[PDB]
Design a protein around this ligand. Sequence first.
Ligand SMILES: CN1CCN(CCCN2c3ccccc3Sc3ccc(C(F)(F)F)cc32)CC1
Ligand SMILES: CN1CCN(CCCN2c3ccccc3Sc3ccc(C(F)(F)F)cc32)CC1
Ligand SMILES: CN1CCN(CCCN2c3ccccc3Sc3ccc(C(F)(F)F)cc32)CC1
Ligand SMILES: CN1CCN(CCCN2c3ccccc3Sc3ccc(C(F)(F)F)cc32)CC1
Ligand SMILES: [Ca+2]
Ligand SMILES: [Ca+2]
Ligand SMILES: [Ca+2]
Ligand SMILES: [Ca+2]
Length: 146
Amino acid sequence: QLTEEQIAEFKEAFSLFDKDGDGTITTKELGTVMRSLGQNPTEAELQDMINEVDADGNGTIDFPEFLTMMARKMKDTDSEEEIREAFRVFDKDGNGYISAAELRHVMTNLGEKLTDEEVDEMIREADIDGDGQVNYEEFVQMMTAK
Ligand SMILES: CN1CCN(CCCN2c3ccccc3Sc3ccc(C(F)(F)F)cc32)CC1
Ligand SMILES: CN1CCN(CCCN2c3ccccc3Sc3ccc(C(F)(F)F)cc32)CC1
Ligand SMILES: CN1CCN(CCCN2c3ccccc3Sc3ccc(C(F)(F)F)cc32)CC1
Ligand SMILES: CN1CCN(CCCN2c3ccccc3Sc3ccc(C(F)(F)F)cc32)CC1
Ligand SMILES: [Ca+2]
Ligand SMILES: [Ca+2]
Ligand SMILES: [Ca+2]
Ligand SMILES: [Ca+2]
């Protein structure tokens, strides 16, 4: 079940979307985060994404709704392609490995300022074989909660 550590981590993640700190993520905020990741949704696709997670139907996502979404899990059968595309946003040089440098660049473009200690830790926790990098297989497992 949801650990307290995961809750604080998810609250941190929540703040990457909730730019203005008003406690809700709007389509505008979702749009700017997606664009920072090289994605380009239309105002309509942005609305569908919010509506899939919007529980009380008020058009925006508050922390409980985000936590709920984040809390839940699915198998790798759940669009391996989405995972593939996400991997590609990190693996900027296309070599098949996410380096600490690549992880840092992505985070910075997202507006998250990590030190060296934090980047290595994020890497260390996803790294299975111990080479200090995250390959696609390691990435998949991080995502599929297994
Ligand atoms: C001031 N100092 C700034 C950096 N933040 C957290 C750094 C990134 N971070 C992180 C890194 C290592 C170990 C735990 C965590 S919590 C966390 C949760 C989500 C994200 C995310 F957002 F990337 F998904 C990033 C982090 C801690 C406080
Ligand atoms: C049922 N299953 C669960 C719901 N979604 C998963 C996450 C929802 N959502 C989303 C939708 C489409 C594509 C990517 C994403 S990531 C994401 C990030 C933030 C939010 C935001 F902003 F709303 F918080 C909503 C989403 C897929 C379908
Ligand atoms: C639950 N247990 C811990 C979580 N995962 C590893 C998560 C590593 N990870 C991370 C770690 C702490 C805080 C936030 C994040 S988000 C994130 C994003 C990219 C990567 C990247 F790019 F390196 F792969 C790794 C992580 C492994 C299983
Ligand atoms: C428990 N089960 C719940 C669902 N997933 C959530 C996705 C992984 N994720 C993550 C992992 C550990 C700690 C914090 C986070 S927030 C986060 C932010 C970005 C990414 C990234 F990298 F994709 F950009 C991945 C994650 C984790 C495992
Ligand atoms: Ca907001
Ligand atoms: Ca809502
Ligand atoms: Ca790479
Ligand atoms: Ca590795």
